[PDB]
């Protein structure tokens, strides 16, 4: 009768490669099928599953209740959207996926599943290479002579930003439905991203996308604290040869961490641990 809210944060950055990505997709579908069976047994509690693909940013995500007959299909659509190829897989943004997932743990789905165990599996093959900065800041959208005619993002979105609403200045799109923010000249400047507290807030992409700095790590750890701060136990699983115990030490609740995991062992690593 134990209720569960279980998230899966899945790295599809370009370091993964399509071979590992395809195995990961197959293994996760097996995990979800096993969990579906467990959730269908007599006396089973409510099991919500959240699945998010991430690279340069978190991409598509879905939340399902495993009692529903389209639950595995909705998870499958997210798996199918994952591109981990070397050339189009993307960068590695821990901070954004942590905040996206923290937002789910603030959601009505999670809060409504009372007395639940909140669990997250973080599945990655490498250190972060992007992060977010300037969160909640107020960028210039249109700079004119003087100040009185300047347009800031705050003049566009006000105090009531709605994620998915399109915002414009003189018919020019400034915030699109996916939350991409542009200046008046059409240059992309930032994104309206999950803040880890249930909201969507301006941020800019930072980092090189192909290397890791102390700042990248510090921002990743800060984002992680928003996720654990919701009362979530995180299990970090390091795939392959390029992620060490120490690279996952900050992102795992109990310090018991599997690294060097082969993609073909992923389902067992999750289900049998
Ligand atoms: Ca990577
Ligand atoms: Ca790799
Ligand atoms: Ca990707
Ligand atoms: Ca940050
Ligand atoms: Ca000005
Ligand atoms: Ca652990």
Residue numbers in the entry: 4498 to 4770
What are the paper's exact sentences on this?
Here, using this criterion and an AlphaFold3 model of a 5047-residue RTX adhesin from Aeromonas hydrophila, we identified three different ligand-binding domains in this fibrillar protein. In both of these bacteria, the adhesins are single polypeptide chains of the repeats-in-toxin (RTX) family that are exported through the Type I secretion system but anchored to the bacterial surface by a retention domain that folds internally and is then too large to pass through the channel of the T1SS. The crystal structures of the two novel domains were solved to 1.4 and 1.95 Å resolution, respectively, and demonstrate excellent agreement with their modeled structures.
